């Protein structure tokens, strides 16, 4: 039987756009039926990278399970994980954000280098998603992350990329002149994925274990 997304497309559903169902009932499907929406599943404007490939990966799944890859309460003792909401992502009158990612910002006037890894001990492929935030102005970069010149690195046995934020005023969309790009990779059983950043990283909170 198909998975019918009644409100969202795969982008919004997999990131956890505020209106999308956590769908903790459907653990398998033969295909996905998607619903178009104004923000295209990304309330914070930006580009979903390798998106068509992801739609194919999620097309027909035999088991599918969401798990808290990096527990919110314990993973980020040196950064602030409780301020990452935005008017771009409203929910019933309140500023909100994606369910499955955390927009980390500085704590006081500090954003130390974060380093966090996850070894896939689930015995099945794990899908991990994250975001890279690009502020509109150097002031916003400082206000959010303290550090003016930052990087994000993500590495596994099959993936390696270093990201540099571009600070620039894009056209205002849902109030935002900044942008957020979205990325994903599949981590094999036994492999380790590592995240390293001095700013601008929208960290995974929930990831997915699945079998095709």
Cα–Cα distance between 203 and 84 in angstroms, integer? 11
Name the structure determination technique.
Answer: X-ray
Residues near 2 by beta carbon (within 8 Å), at least 6 away in sequence: 29, 30, 31, 32, 33
Which residues of the chain form beta strands (DSSP E)? 3-4, 32-33, 63-67, 86-91, 94-96, 101-103, 114-119, 125-134, 152-155, 160-163, 179-187, 192-197, 201-204, 207-211
Token couple for 135: 């502020």
Q: Which residues pair with 110 in a beta bridge?
A: 107
Backbone angles phi, psi at 8, to 5 degrees: -130, 170
Say if CB 208 and CB 65 are below 8 A apart. Answer: yes
Terminal CA-CA length for the chain:
14
Helix (H, G, I), strand (E, B) or coil at 140: helix
Break sites following residues in the chain (C–N > 2.5 A):
none
Task: Report domain 1-212's class.
Answer: alpha beta
Helical segments of the chain, H only: 10-15, 51-57, 138-145
How is the chain split into domains, by residue range? 1-212
DSSP designation for 39: T
Cβ atoms within 10 Å, residue 154: 21
Q: How many Å is the Cα radius of gyration of the chain?
A: 17
Cα–Cα distance between 151 and 194 in angstroms, integer? 14
């Amino acid at each position: 039987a198909p998975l019918h997304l009644g409100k969202c497309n795969i982008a919004g559903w997999i990131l956890g756009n505020p209106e999308c169902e956590s769908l903790s009932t459907a653990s398998s499907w033969s295909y996905i039926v998607e619903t178009p929406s104004s923000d295209n599943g990304t309330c914070y404007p930006g580009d979903f990278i390798d998106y068509e490939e992801l739609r194919e990966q999620l097309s027909s799944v035999s088991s599918f399970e969401r798990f808290e890859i990096f527990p919110k309460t314990s993973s980020w003792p040196n950064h602030d994980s409780n301020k990452g909401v935005t008017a771009a992502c409203p929910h019933a009158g309140a500023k909100s954000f994606y369910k499955n990612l955390i927009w980390l910002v500085k704590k006081g006037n500090s954003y130390p280098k974060l380093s966090k890894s996850y070894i896939n001990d689930k015995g099945k492929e794990v899908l991990v998603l994250w975001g890279i935030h690009h502020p509109s102005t150097s002031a916003d970069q400082q206000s959010l992350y303290q550090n003016a010149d930052t990087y994000v690195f993500v590495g596994s046995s099959r993936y390696s990329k270093k990201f540099k934020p571009e600070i620039a005023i894009r056209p205002k969309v849902r109030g935002q002149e900044g942008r957020m790009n979205y990325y994903w990779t599949l981590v094999e059983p036994g492999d380790k994925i590592t995240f390293e950043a001095t700013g601008n990283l929208v960290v995974p909170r929930y990831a997915f274990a699945m079998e095709r």
